[PDB]
Write a protein that binds this ligand. Structure first.
Ligand SMILES: [K+]
Ligand SMILES: [Mg+2]
Length: 106
RNA sequence: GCGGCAUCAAUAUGGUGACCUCCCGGGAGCGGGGGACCACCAGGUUGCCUAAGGAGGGGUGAACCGGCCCAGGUCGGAAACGGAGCAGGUCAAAACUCCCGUGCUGUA
């Protein structure tokens, strides 16, 4: 439950524009074009998740130093005790697929 | 060796590299492992109604387009470390180009 134990979401995980080795985490059929951390958190937060922005972190695998291309997003799943904060997001993978599907909407 | 033209394919085994798609593990950088597909390679067969199909020797690789190894610096990290990768070094294997040889064909 300690922020230090929040999981990580780098936009690169979600970027349909990046190869596996550039860091893509979800299938292109679900991936998305150039999502930004902000977005990522902006969807998560408004789902009842606990999540904050590290606007300044920078994914390793990302030579470009442009902003649109940076920031990390921290999301708490389980409750210090051990329960997920929302039955619907067990896996980090679950989060990723969700974020990936709601952003197209904002 | 004067001028012309033209020079494999498909099979097995073991590399190299991309890419896609799934799990398991993790607070990052990540660890673990299953499939699919492409390109290139090694040297071993196989073959066609080849005119011949050696699987030859070089060079470029460079303002991102190659593979490796990567000083620095940079990003993740409390650190250990790890990633991405420039310079430089380097090469059985991105791609593009040079030398041959070799086979048929040739006519004044
Ligand atoms: K160091
Ligand atoms: Mg695999």
């Amino acid at each position: 439950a300690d922020q230090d134990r929040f999981i990580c979401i780098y936009p690169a995980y979600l970027n349909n524009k990046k190869t596996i080795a550039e860091g893509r985490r979800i299938p292109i059929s679900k991936a998305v074009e150039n999502p930004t951390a902000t977005e990522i958190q902006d969807v998560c937060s408004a789902v009842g998740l606990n999540v904050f922005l590290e606007k300044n972190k920078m994914y390793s695998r990302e030579w470009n130093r442009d902003v649109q291309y940076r920031g990390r997003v921290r999301v708490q799943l389980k409750q210090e005790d051990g329960s997920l904060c929302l039955v619907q997001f067990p896996s980090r993978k679950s989060v990723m697929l969700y974020a990936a599907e709601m952003i197209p909407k904002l």
